[PDB]
Amino acid sequence: EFPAPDPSVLVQNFNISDFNGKWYITSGLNPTFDAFDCQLHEFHTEGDNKLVGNISWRIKTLDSGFFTRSAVQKFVQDPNQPGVLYNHDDWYILSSKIENKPEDYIFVYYRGRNDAWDGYGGAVVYTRSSVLPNSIIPELEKAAKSIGRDFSTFIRTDNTCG
Structure with a gap:
């Protein structure tokens, strides 16, 4: 499977400060990465x-154990397209709802x-919750369709963090 991006399918406003704090990924497209x-x-902001x-x-x-890995990723927002963050790997924000409620994504x-x-x-879905909320699934289906994908093909991830 290949990419490209597409301007009218991106969120048209986005405030980077809305990423602040903790998010889980509760669904991903690419099983190698996502x-x-x-x-x-966990996100913070440096400058605007x-x-x-x-x-x-x-x-x-295969032991059925696990190792934890950590990394630092840094992005700079496009001044003209708020839904585009270039790595400073580029991120394109297809959809978001932030109202400071447990279903934010x-x-x-x-x-x-x-x-x-x-x-x-x-593609990944960040959510405030450790679980993929049922409430945001029509938005996610709609966004996945805008990039040529069927959301039912995404893998739901396991955030039992025990």
């Missing part, structure tokens, strides 16, 4: 256009390159 257990991501994420996840061994499509002639990409 479907790990216990993906907890940089988003810094402290990213964690588990890798599941941000739906992120990403692409990257592994060299000049090959790219990869994926």
Whole structure:
């Protein structure tokens, strides 16, 4: 499966400060990148256009154990397209609802390159909750359709963080 992006399918306003704090990923498209257990991501903002994420996840061994991994990802917001954050791997915000309620979510499509002639990409749903809320599924279906995908094809992830 390949990418591209597309301007009219992005959120048209987005405040990077709405990423502040903790989010889980509760659903992902690419099983290589997007479907790990216990993906907890914590975000702050530096200046008015940089988003810094402290990213964690588990890798599941065949032993049925796991190791936790951590990383730092940093993005700068496009001054003209608020739904585009370039890595400073690019993120395109397809849909979001932030009302400071437990069902808040941000739906992120990403692409990257592994060299000049090959790219990869994926999508994840960030939510305040550890569980994928049923309340946001028509929005997610609609957003996944806007990038040519069927939301039923996404993998729901496991945030039992025990």
